[PDB]
Amino acid sequence: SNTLFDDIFQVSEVDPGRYNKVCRIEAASTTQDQCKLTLDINVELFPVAAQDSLTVTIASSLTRSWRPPQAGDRSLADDYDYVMYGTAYKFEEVSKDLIAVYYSFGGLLMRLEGNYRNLNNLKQENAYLLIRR
Template sequence: MADVQLLDAVFTITEIDNKRYDRVSRIAGTSSDSTLTMTLDINHELFHCQVGESISMALATTLELDGAAKEGAETSWRNVSRTGYSTLADMYDYVCYGRHYKFEDGDGGNAKCYASFGGLLLYLEGPYNKLSSLKIDNFYMLIKRA
């Protein structure tokens, strides 16, 4: 089985642009170890954040706590409240399912990863060894306050 958790990082928000859309803000941040930079479109009605605030972001291949990749509507994250069992989404405040659509090798061992979560975009830049696991088609993005 492949590693379930692709990335786990804490970002400090350095900039917020909410002038373009009614419900969406573009936030920018730097990881706590200063190796990753992130730009993310986020629905600020569902998850409001401020400059200087820290958020924890995880990228995972499944929401199952045991790491199993289960298929079918009965295990969909939308049906969790009806089935009564816990998932990784219960530990986070903002959860999206998206698609990686571009990966670029950058200068000096860096890489750039682009993903879309229903049109809300994520851009990550940092060391290749931290981002290389994101070369898969689909994954979940989970965010909570750090």
């Protein structure tokens, strides 16, 4: 029960799809070349302008009821400023030794393709996303 993926991305396109509080972001992975992602982001909470640099992570934790944080006792496992919860509904296979995963953060959708995440992102429903500044 720990971090499953980490990378840092530079955004290329922000697309408001006839919307006011939601944009479709388009970013490739820096420090790599054959890895890019397409993600839906609530702009009103975290403003994501063009040419930003977004540290992105995915964990499995940190069913049961969602109680409020209530205190510092239920300490957050994040120094980020954005988090979401999604479900793994499709894992695409673009080619041999290449893989793409699809997530749905309650209607907000996530595209992510790459090579080396083939030890995590299992078929379990539980899936998180965390985005730093």
